[PDB]
Design an enzyme around this catalytic site. Sequence first.
Site, PDB file in Angstrom:
ATOM      1  N   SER A   3      42.930  47.110  33.333  1.00  0.00           N
ATOM      2  CA  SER A   3      43.569  47.025  34.555  1.00  0.00           C
ATOM      3  C   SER A   3      44.377  45.805  35.005  1.00  0.00           C
ATOM      4  O   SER A   3      43.755  44.733  34.418  1.00  0.00           O
ATOM      5  CB  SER A   3      42.459  47.415  35.856  1.00  0.00           C
ATOM      6  OG  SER A   3      42.211  48.720  35.698  1.00  0.00           O
ATOM      7  N   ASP A  37      48.633  49.762  44.715  1.00  0.00           N
ATOM      8  CA  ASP A  37      47.673  48.774  43.970  1.00  0.00           C
ATOM      9  C   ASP A  37      48.354  47.733  43.092  1.00  0.00           C
ATOM     10  O   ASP A  37      48.747  47.823  41.970  1.00  0.00           O
ATOM     11  CB  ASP A  37      47.224  49.785  42.814  1.00  0.00           C
ATOM     12  CG  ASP A  37      45.891  49.186  42.030  1.00  0.00           C
ATOM     13  OD1 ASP A  37      45.289  50.094  40.944  1.00  0.00           O
ATOM     14  OD2 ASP A  37      45.490  48.253  42.483  1.00  0.00           O
ATOM     15  N   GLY A  91      38.953  47.844  31.923  1.00  0.00           N
ATOM     16  CA  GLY A  91      39.115  46.432  31.230  1.00  0.00           C
ATOM     17  C   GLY A  91      40.631  46.275  31.300  1.00  0.00           C
ATOM     18  O   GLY A  91      40.851  45.094  31.393  1.00  0.00           O
ATOM     19  N   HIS A 118      43.230  46.428  43.195  1.00  0.00           N
ATOM     20  CA  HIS A 118      41.880  47.136  43.067  1.00  0.00           C
ATOM     21  C   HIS A 118      40.695  46.339  42.315  1.00  0.00           C
ATOM     22  O   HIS A 118      39.652  46.518  42.061  1.00  0.00           O
ATOM     23  CB  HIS A 118      41.890  48.538  42.388  1.00  0.00           C
ATOM     24  CG  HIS A 118      41.767  48.578  40.873  1.00  0.00           C
ATOM     25  ND1 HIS A 118      42.836  48.922  40.314  1.00  0.00           N
ATOM     26  CD2 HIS A 118      40.841  48.361  39.862  1.00  0.00           C
ATOM     27  CE1 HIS A 118      42.487  48.957  38.724  1.00  0.00           C
ATOM     28  NE2 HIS A 118      41.497  48.512  38.718  1.00  0.00           N
TER      29      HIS A 118
HETATM   30  N1  LIG Z   1      43.561  56.424  30.853  1.00  0.00           N
HETATM   31  C1  LIG Z   1      43.909  55.259  31.301  1.00  0.00           C
HETATM   32  N2  LIG Z   1      44.877  54.910  30.822  1.00  0.00           N
HETATM   33  C2  LIG Z   1      43.416  54.424  32.278  1.00  0.00           C
HETATM   34  C3  LIG Z   1      44.064  53.279  32.909  1.00  0.00           C
HETATM   35  C4  LIG Z   1      43.091  52.482  33.817  1.00  0.00           C
HETATM   36  C5  LIG Z   1      41.737  52.698  34.117  1.00  0.00           C
HETATM   37  C6  LIG Z   1      41.175  51.920  34.757  1.00  0.00           C
HETATM   38  C7  LIG Z   1      39.658  52.010  34.836  1.00  0.00           C
HETATM   39  C8  LIG Z   1      38.900  53.368  34.554  1.00  0.00           C
HETATM   40  C9  LIG Z   1      39.923  54.121  33.538  1.00  0.00           C
HETATM   41  N3  LIG Z   1      39.283  55.472  33.102  1.00  0.00           N
HETATM   42  C10 LIG Z   1      37.979  55.225  32.233  1.00  0.00           C
HETATM   43  N4  LIG Z   1      37.521  56.496  31.713  1.00  0.00           N
HETATM   44  C11 LIG Z   1      36.468  56.598  30.878  1.00  0.00           C
HETATM   45  C12 LIG Z   1      35.587  55.277  30.239  1.00  0.00           C
HETATM   46  C13 LIG Z   1      36.357  54.122  30.903  1.00  0.00           C
HETATM   47  N5  LIG Z   1      37.551  54.199  31.728  1.00  0.00           N
HETATM   48  C14 LIG Z   1      41.189  53.909  33.503  1.00  0.00           C
HETATM   49  C15 LIG Z   1      42.099  54.739  32.494  1.00  0.00           C
END
Ligand SMILES: N=C(N)c1ccc2cccc(Nc3ncccn3)c2c1
Length: 245
Positions: free
Chosen positions: A198, A97, A196, A46
């Site tokens: 990922s 992924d 950030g 991704h």
């Molecule tokens: N919950 C995770 N561990 C987790 C893991 C990977 C994630 C990758 C992108 C965005 C997310 N979600 C997100 N939501 C709100 C503001 C910023 N990002 C994620 C959340």
Amino acid sequence: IIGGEFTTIENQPWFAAIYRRHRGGSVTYVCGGSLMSPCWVISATHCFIDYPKKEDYIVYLGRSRLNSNTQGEMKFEVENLILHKDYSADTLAHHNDIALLKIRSKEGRCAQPSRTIQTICLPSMYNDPQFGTSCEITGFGKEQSTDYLYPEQLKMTVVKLISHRECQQPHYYGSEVTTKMLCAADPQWKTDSCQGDSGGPLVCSLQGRMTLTGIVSWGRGCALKDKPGVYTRVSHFLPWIRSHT
Ligand SMILES: N=C(N)c1ccc2cccc(Nc3ncccn3)c2c1
């Protein structure tokens, strides 16, 4: 990483910082990754699917800050970017992924293991840690869900694995999460991975050995109640990793 603490690369030396160069010369951070072998970094498909040109990426090993050349770091370009052919993304859930980046310095060499640069071992088939196990994650991801910038210093935290049965409960992710995915979170919902982070490593100590159990993939919110982080389950993909490396 929400909560946790600031750290340096000597504490997570298999961590790869992946950046992307844009026309005009600006460089921005993309995702983390993990060194599995001198020539190969494993991440999440991704992170590259929308810009699948290997020439755009810069990979650093031995780097502790987002905008500072840490003593001992090494920079590489990507010789081969391999994406899983059956990757796909639903509204929340991402499938298959997983991605591999063959790296090479400007001189044509792979990584040189050192005090701040080292590989992380892959898991064995049909043998992941039991639910309840604490595992660590690392990344330059957001510190609060409402932030728009990433921290300048690398961060790390600890979370616990959650069973497939629990993660498929209605208030958690229902049938959206599959047997090819692994969940993990803080029982108090105060710390977690976030955007950030990922592509980064989910590392678990099992039978005495540190192993790359998961790859940061997706989650609803960051440290939000009843919504764990979801990670690609590396053990399922051993046949594909060996075939493509
Ligand atoms: N919950 C995770 N561990 C987790 C893991 C990977 C994630 C990758 C992108 C965005 C997310 N979600 C997100 N939501 C709100 C503001 C910023 N990002 C994620 C959340």
